[PDB]
Structure 1
Amino acid sequence: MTGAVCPGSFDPVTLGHVDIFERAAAQFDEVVVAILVNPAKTGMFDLDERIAMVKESTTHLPNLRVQVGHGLVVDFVRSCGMTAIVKGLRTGTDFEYELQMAQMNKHIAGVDTFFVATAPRYSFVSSSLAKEVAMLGGDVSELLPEPVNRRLRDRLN
């Protein structure tokens, strides 16, 4: 029973994220997408919306489930009966930041992190940039799953 957790805010989930989910689901018997919500409430979509968008965008991955994460990600990972986190990397700068978190996570809980390199076509896709461009009237529909596009179009209509 090999398993990985894919943690993130997913606000909203992008096609870059879905790519990572697919790639994790191909290599681990079970994948859990863990949505870690910002407490301060500064995000675009609420938690219920973020969950629905991930679920709606991952109906083709039978071995993937979606859950809200609470506390340290390592504690969530251990509560799933797993010892691996899977995350995507776009750049060397991303790597150096994630490296610190991964080494810390291994230190405190013995939980390992496996990184996958972004698909080339989604290298520039982030939730933040997608939101920024969307908020200014730009068309980012090709970078996001249709379930997200539907919701985005409803907010600007």
Structure 2
Amino acid sequence: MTGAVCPGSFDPVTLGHVDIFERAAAQFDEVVVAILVNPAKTGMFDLDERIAMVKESTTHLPNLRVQVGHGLVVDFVRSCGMTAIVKGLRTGTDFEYELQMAQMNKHIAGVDTFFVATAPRYSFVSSSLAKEVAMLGGDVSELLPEPVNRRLRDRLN
């Protein structure tokens, strides 16, 4: 009867994201991770790689599924038969923008957005900073799932 969508680019998924997936799966009957397409072309990992990384990092969550999102998040959400979005907060989150989008999403489709603080140990990782640090030779392996580290190292070597 209950369901939530966890939308994002996940380029790549981090342990911060996985923390949020785990909490959504614990509180909702079904969770759908919506991987948004990168239309303007310029990400690090292509869509298939991002799906695989999320799937491989979430095998311990039987009530969670992974799907590609297209168009408005609220359209995807309602297409899943749901009316809730679950999003993580971490250090560096643009929360004012997240609030603006949440209020807009409520306005246009009646979809609620629930925010949850990510675990402190994963509160400073973001996809973008993780990539930037790793590209410059820094070790972020404790902040990403092993399926992601495997792929990141390959791009390095």
TM-score normalised over the length of structure 1: 0.98
Query: What is the aligned-residue RMSD (CA, Å)?
Result: 1.0
Taking the aligned partners of 2:39 and 2:13, their CA distance within structure 1 comes to 18
- Contact (CA 8 Å) 2:91, 2:124: kept in 1 or not? no
Aligned residue-pair number = 157
Q: Give the Å deviation of 1:26.
A: 0.2
The alpha-carbon distance between structure 1 residues 91 and 14, as it changes in their structure 2 partners (threshold 3 A), is closer
The alpha-carbon distance between structure 1 residues 14 and 60, as it changes in their structure 2 partners (threshold 3 A), is same
Taking the aligned partners of 1:123 and 1:60, their CA distance within structure 2 comes to 21
The alpha-carbon distance between structure 1 residues 11 and 93, as it changes in their structure 2 partners (threshold 3 A), is closer
The alpha-carbon distance between structure 1 residues 15 and 47, as it changes in their structure 2 partners (threshold 3 A), is same
The alpha-carbon distance between structure 1 residues 93 and 67, as it changes in their structure 2 partners (threshold 3 A), is closer
- Identical columns (%): 100
Taking the aligned partners of 2:55 and 2:149, their CA distance within structure 1 comes to 14
Q: Give the Å deviation of 1:92.
A: 8.2
Report Cα offsets for 1:122-156 as digits up to 9, x if no partner.
11100000000011011111110000000001011
The alpha-carbon distance between structure 1 residues 148 and 93, as it changes in their structure 2 partners (threshold 3 A), is closer
Q: Which residue of 2 aligns with 1:96?
A: 96
Taking the aligned partners of 2:72 and 2:94, their CA distance within structure 1 comes to 20
The alpha-carbon distance between structure 1 residues 133 and 37, as it changes in their structure 2 partners (threshold 3 A), is same
Q: Give the Å deviation of 1:94.
A: 2.5
Alignment pair present for 1:131 and 2:134: no
Secondary structure of 1:38's counterpart equals coil
Secondary structure of 2:6's counterpart equals strand
Taking the aligned partners of 1:94 and 1:53, their CA distance within structure 2 comes to 25
Any gaps of 5 or more consecutive residues in structure 2? none
Structure 1 runs (4+) greater than 3 angstroms displaced: none
Per mean C-alpha deviation after superposition, the further-off stretch among 88-97 and 136-145 is: 88-97
Report Cα offsets for 1:56-115 as digits up to 9, x if no partner.
000000000000000000000000000000000125863211000000000000011001
- Contact (CA 8 Å) 2:92, 2:124: kept in 1 or not? no
TM-score normalised over the length of structure 2: 0.98
Taking the aligned partners of 2:76 and 2:17, their CA distance within structure 1 comes to 19
The alpha-carbon distance between structure 1 residues 101 and 80, as it changes in their structure 2 partners (threshold 3 A), is same
